[PDB]
Structure formats: structure tokens, C-alpha cells
């Protein structure tokens, strides 16, 4: 839980001033004002949509979700209103496969990649009982969303250091890319789909493109293979005084 990249080599996460404004009885929040407001809305538009580059006649259909956001200052309700939009399903649901839609919900709303096939198949268990709105509100009303983001900050890609699986850090680095990278470049076709269902890992050059500036992006590759052989049984011996002991 130290995480040597997070507030050192990246920026600080954006969001509202505090969460004590909800208990204030003459206001609802520290009132930001329309220069301090819309530059936070620029960071929700760059995160829920990727870099989708939404036009002026596509933002006009999102007029109602901002007008509620500048009165009720909850960030989580703004993210929930933008994921049930037409502009979220015409980019990430309409021409994609099912695990491509699921792997972008982990990117846009959690900042991580899915850790399992069992965690991934339970999101298709919620598709059968309520469609795509049952997937979206179960991510938003989860415990993992509450104890990382809450109502206060935008859901950002967080370098944690103490990931519950090491593979979770790998699939986060494939999902986000560089800053000149959107998420329409594959023709559908989930990137993490082979590695979730089989149990293997990712490619080292695809992860090191998305690492920050100043973190040895790519070195360490020996010129032999990049993954491990599960069938190999090596002999690793320890020197004692007399000989060499192969505690296998």
C-alpha cells in the first residue's frame, strides 16, 4: 500500500472540494462556480467515454445530466446518468462483443481490469436478470466503488501497489493506453478475452506503452520468450557446506 508511482509520477485525482458539504444545512456543497465546475465535467467526459471526442450535437443530449450535476453535486450520480445514456451504448454496447462491453465497464467505472473468469461470468449473470442497467448499477453500488471513489472524486486509474492479484495490474495497463488512445480501435474484439478465460497473461510492450513517464518502460525483456512454461520443472539447488541440496 505504498505504491511508488501514484502521487509521485502521475497527477493527483480530480473531484469535488469535500464530502462534508452534504452535512451542511444551508448548502449542499462548497459551490464551485462555472469555471471550477466545467473543468471537472471535462474530466468526467474524458473518463467515462475514453477519448471519444463527442461533438456539440452529441453533448446536447447530455444537457439534462449536467444540469442536475450542478445542483446535486454527487459525482457518482453523474457517472450513473452518463452510463445509461444513448452516447454510452452507441459506443461500447452497439458494435462490440459481450466481454468487450464488460471490460470497458471495469475501465470507465473502476479504473482496474477484471481479475477472474468467475468475476466476469457473474456480470453476465446480471445481464440475464435486467439487461445492461443491472451491470452498471451493481458496479456503481458496490463496496469497491464506495471505498475508493465515493461521491467525491472521478473514478481514475489508481496505482495501488497492493493489488489482490498481480494479473489485475496487467489487465489495467492493457485497458488504459497512452493519452493519444481511445477505445474504438479494435473492431469490437475484447483484448483481455483470451487471457481471462484461459488464465494466461498479457504482452509486455502493450503494458509498457501505458506506464507513466519515468518508470523504465520496456527494459528487462530478455531476448528469449516473455511468458512462463507451466510444465517445466527446474532444479534449483542450495549450497550447504558439504554439497548442494535440491529441496524439491
Amino acid at each position: 500500500a505504498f505504491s511508488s508511482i501514484q502521487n509521485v509520477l502521475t497527477d493527483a485525482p480530480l473531484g469535488t472540494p469535500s464530502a462534508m458539504g452534504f452535512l451542511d444545512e444551508r448548502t449542499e456543497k462548497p459551490l464551485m462556480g462555472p469555471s471550477e465546475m466545467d473543468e471537472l465535467v471535462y474530466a468526467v467526459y474524458k473518463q467515462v467515454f475514453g477519448n471519444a471526442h463527442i461533438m456539440e450535437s452529441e453533448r446536447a443530449e447530455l444537457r439534462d445530466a449536467e444540469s442536475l450535476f450542478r445542483y446535486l453535486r454527487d459525482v457518482r450520480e453523474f457517472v450513473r446518468a452518463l452510463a445509461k445514456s444513448n452516447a454510452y451504448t452507441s459506443r461500447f454496447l452497439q458494435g462490440n462483443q459481450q466481454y468487450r462491453f464488460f471490460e470497458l465497464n471495469f475501465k470507465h467505472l473502476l479504473g482496474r481490469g477484471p481479475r477472474s473468469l468467475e468475476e466476469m461470468a457473474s456480470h453476465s449473470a446480471l445481464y440475464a436478470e435486467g439487461g445492461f442497467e443491472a451491470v452498471i448499477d451493481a458496479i456503481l453500488d458496490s463496496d469497491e466503488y464506495a471505498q475508493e471513489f465515493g461521491s467525491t472524486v472521478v473514478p481514475y486509474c489508481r496505482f495501488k501497489g497492493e493489488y489482490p492479484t498481480n494479473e489485475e495490474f496487467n489487465r489495467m495497463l492493457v485497458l488504459k493506453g497512452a493519452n493519444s488512445t481511445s477505445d474504438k480501435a479494435g473492431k469490437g474484439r475484447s483484448k483481455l478475452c483470451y487471457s481471462i478465460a484461459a488464465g494466461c497473461s498479457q504482452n509486455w510492450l502493450s503494458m509498457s506503452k501505458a506506464l507513466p513517464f519515468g518508470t523504465e518502460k520496456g527494459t528487462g525483456f530478455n531476448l528469449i520468450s516473455s511468458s512462463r512454461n507451466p510444465a517445466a520443472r527446474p532444479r534449483i539447488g542450495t549450497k550447504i557446506p558439504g554439497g548442494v541440496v535440491f529441496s524439491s
Binding site: 485525482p13 469535500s18 464530502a19 452534504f22 457518482r76 450520480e77 464506495a146 471505498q147 465515493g150 467525491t152
Partner: peptide
């Protein structure tokens, strides 16, 4: 920046339950 003693939609509830 999350400040653990905090909620999101029971905060919606009790302002429309103390009036009730």
C-alpha cells in the same frame, strides 16, 4: 478523499423522511 463516514443515496432518503 473519500472520508469513510459518508453515504450517497441514504443522504437522498433522510431529507425526504424527516419531512415525512
Amino acid at each position: 478523499r473519500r472520508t469513510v463516514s459518508f453515504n450517497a443515496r441514504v443522504a437522498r432518503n433522510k431529507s425526504q423522511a424527516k419531512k415525512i
